[PDB]
Scaffold this active site. Structure first.
Site, PDB file in Angstrom:
ATOM      1  N   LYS A  50      20.241  69.056  17.249  1.00  0.00           N
ATOM      2  CA  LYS A  50      21.347  69.883  17.748  1.00  0.00           C
ATOM      3  C   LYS A  50      21.492  69.781  19.277  1.00  0.00           C
ATOM      4  O   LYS A  50      22.571  70.022  19.794  1.00  0.00           O
ATOM      5  CB  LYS A  50      21.147  71.355  17.330  1.00  0.00           C
ATOM      6  N   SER A  55      19.889  78.037  16.358  1.00  0.00           N
ATOM      7  CA  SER A  55      19.721  76.990  15.364  1.00  0.00           C
ATOM      8  C   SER A  55      20.626  77.226  14.167  1.00  0.00           C
ATOM      9  O   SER A  55      20.346  76.749  13.073  1.00  0.00           O
ATOM     10  CB  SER A  55      18.285  76.773  14.993  1.00  0.00           C
ATOM     11  N   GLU A  64      23.703  69.659   7.771  1.00  0.00           N
ATOM     12  CA  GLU A  64      22.778  70.709   7.375  1.00  0.00           C
ATOM     13  C   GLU A  64      23.122  71.196   5.978  1.00  0.00           C
ATOM     14  O   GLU A  64      24.293  71.370   5.671  1.00  0.00           O
ATOM     15  CB  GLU A  64      22.874  71.935   8.283  1.00  0.00           C
ATOM     16  N   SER A  73      16.040  70.368  13.387  1.00  0.00           N
ATOM     17  CA  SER A  73      17.080  70.899  14.231  1.00  0.00           C
ATOM     18  C   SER A  73      17.029  70.396  15.670  1.00  0.00           C
ATOM     19  O   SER A  73      17.924  70.749  16.439  1.00  0.00           O
ATOM     20  CB  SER A  73      17.029  72.454  14.255  1.00  0.00           C
TER      21      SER A  73
HETATM   22 CL   LIG Z   1      14.443  75.848  14.465  1.00  0.00          CL
HETATM   23 CL   LIG Z   2      14.398  78.233  13.517  1.00  0.00          CL
HETATM   24 MG   LIG Z   3      15.634  75.488  13.255  1.00  0.00          MG
END
Ligand SMILES: [Cl-]
Ligand SMILES: [Cl-]
Ligand SMILES: [Mg+2]
Ligand SMILES: [Cl-]
Ligand SMILES: [Cl-]
Ligand SMILES: [Mg+2]
Ligand SMILES: [Mg+2]
Ligand SMILES: [Mg+2]
Lengths: 265, 267
Positions: free
Chosen positions: B47, B105, B141, B44
Site C-alpha cells: 500500500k 491498512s 485485497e 499490506s
Molecule cells: Cl497491517
Molecule cells: Cl493491520
Molecule cells: Mg495490514
C-alpha cells in the site's frame, strides 16, 4: 415519550448506571430525552466543539489549516498516540491536530489546539456565542476527566451538547467548507464503532465523538442522517462504574438502538 | 556484516522464524542485510508504493486529491474500518482513501485506489518504472495475503522494497509536495507502534507501513531520520507461524533494535 423514558430507566436499574440522553432535530428541538437537563462531564466530547472553534477561527482568517504547531516531548500526554508519532518532527499542523483530536481523541493534539484558541475560557466563550448557556470547559487534558459528582467544571447537559452539535453540523455558523470538513472528520471517527453507531443501521450517515472518564463515565454524541434524509443529533452521557468497558459501550449502543426505534416511528 | 547477520540468524532460530531484512542508506545502498534477496509476500506493505503511484498521478495532473471515489456496500471488505464508516455517504475522496489505506491498512480503500490506477498490473508497471525489477502485485485485497510458499504473486524482496521505498521517500520521482505528504502520512501510521518504531529511539523520525498475512507473515518497512539528520530505510519481512501475534511484532522490533545498534556505530 413515556415508553422511551421507561426504557432508559430500565437500562439504569439493570446496569446500576446513570444515563442522560437527548435526541434532537436538525433545528435543535427535543424529540426524546431522559435526564436531558442534568449535568454530566464532557470528557472528550468537548473536542468536537473545540474543532469547530478552530474551524471558526480559520473561517475568520485568524488561523491557517497548514500552520505548524511546534512542540516537543514536554507537551506529550499519557494518551497521545498521534502526537507521540510526530514528536520527533517537532510539529503537527492545525489540520493534523484537529484530525487526531477528533478521530483518535489524542490529548496532546487537543491541548495544542486549546493553546492556540486561548484555552478553556475561550472554548466556554465559544459555547456562549452559539447560544449554549450551560456547556463549559475549565481544565486542559487530562485533568478535565475527573468527573467528580457535584463538580461543574468541564460539564454539559445531554440537551445542551445535542443542541450545540446540531447547530454546528446542520446550522450555518461555520462556512460551508469548514462545516463539510467537520462532518467528514466526524464520520471518520475511529473510536465510536461500538457506541451510538452500533445501535444505528449502517445505511444511515453517522458521525460522532466519544468520551471516557473517571468514575465510570462513558459518553458519545453523534449526528446522523436517515435514508429519508432526516437529520438528528443524539447525545448519550453515562456513569456506569459497575460495568466493564465493553459493557459501557454496549450501554450506549442500547440507548442508540432505542432512539433508532423512535426515529423510525 | 557478520555480527548483524548472526544476530538475525539467532532470532530465526529462537523464534522458529524466517526473517529477511535490508537496511539501506538514503541513496538505496545496502548497509546491512539478511536474506535480503529472498522473496517474501508484500502483504499490506504494497500500500506504500500504491499511495506513491496515486501521488505520482496527482503530480502529473492525471488525478485530484479531492476527487470523490464513489462506492457502495458491494465494495466493502472484511477489514475496511474507514470505508465502512463512509459507505452511507457513497464515497471517499482520493485523499481519504490514501490516508485510510496507509494509516489503517483499510482493504476497501486500497482496492478503491487500485481500481483508479489500473489495478495490480499497473502497480507492477510502476515498480518497474522505478527500477524495481522484482516487486509485483497480482491480486487485489484480500486474496493477495495468502503467502503460499513458492508463489511469486504479490511478492517483493527486503532489498527491493527497501530500495523502492528509499527512492520514493528521498529521491526525485515524486514532487516535493507529494514526498512530504507521503512522509507525514507514514509518520502518522497507526499500526506500527510495536514493530520497527518500537526498536528505534523516540528522537528519530520514523514512518512505516506494516503487513500481516496468512502462514504467520508479519512485515514492516520504515524510513527513518536520525538526530544527525542521516536518512535510512529498513525493510523487515518475517514468517513466524509458531509465534502469537504480539510476539510477531516483538520480533520485528528486535530486528529494528539490532539495526539501531548498527546505525549508531556507523554514525
Ligand atoms: Cl497491517
Ligand atoms: Cl493491520
Ligand atoms: Mg495490514
Ligand atoms: Cl498514547
Ligand atoms: Cl495525500
Ligand atoms: Mg493526497
Ligand atoms: Mg490490523
Ligand atoms: Mg506486527
Amino acid at each position: 415519550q413515556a415508553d422511551f423514558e421507561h426504557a432508559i430507566s430500565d437500562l439504569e436499574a439493570h446496569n446500576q448506571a446513570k444515563i442522560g440522553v437527548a435526541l434532537v432535530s436538525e433545528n435543535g428541538n427535543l424529540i426524546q430525552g431522559y435526564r436531558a437537563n442534568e449535568r454530566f462531564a464532557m470528557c472528550s466530547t468537548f473536542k468536537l466543539p473545540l474543532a469547530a472553534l478552530v474551524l471558526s477561527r480559520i473561517d475568520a482568517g485568524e488561523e491557517n489549516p497548514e500552520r505548524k504547531l511546534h512542540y516537543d516531548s514536554a507537551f506529550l500526554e499519557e494518551y497521545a498516540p498521534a502526537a507521540k508519532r510526530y514528536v520527533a518532527t517537532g510539529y503537527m499542523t492545525v489540520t493534523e491536530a484537529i484530525q487526531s483530536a477528533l478521530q483518535l481523541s489524542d490529548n496532546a493534539a487537543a491541548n495544542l489546539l486549546l493553546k492556540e484558541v486561548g484555552g478553556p475560557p475561550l472554548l466556554t466563550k465559544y459555547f456562549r456565542s452559539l447560544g449554549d448557556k450551560v456547556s463549559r470547559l475549565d481544565r486542559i487534558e487530562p485533568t478535565l476527566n475527573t468527573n467528580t459528582p457535584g463538580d461543574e467544571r468541564d460539564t454539559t447537559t445531554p440537551m445542551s451538547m445535542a443542541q450545540t452539535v446540531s447547530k454546528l453540523i446542520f446550522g450555518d455558523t461555520l462556512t460551508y467548507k469548514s462545516k463539510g470538513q467537520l462532518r467528514r472528520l466526524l464520520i471518520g471517527n475511529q473510536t465510536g464503532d461500538k457506541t451510538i453507531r452500533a445501535g444505528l443501521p449502517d445505511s444511515w450517515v453517522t458521525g460522532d465523538k466519544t468520551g471516557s472518564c473517571a468514575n465510570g463515565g462513558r459518553n458519545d454524541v453523534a449526528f446522523f442522517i436517515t435514508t429519508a434524509g432526516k437529520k438528528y443529533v443524539l447525545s448519550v452521557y453515562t456513569n456506569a462504574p459497575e460495568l466493564q468497558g465493553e459493557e459501557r459501550a454496549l450501554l450506549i449502543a442500547s440507548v442508540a438502538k432505542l432512539a433508532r426505534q423512535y426515529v423510525v416511528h
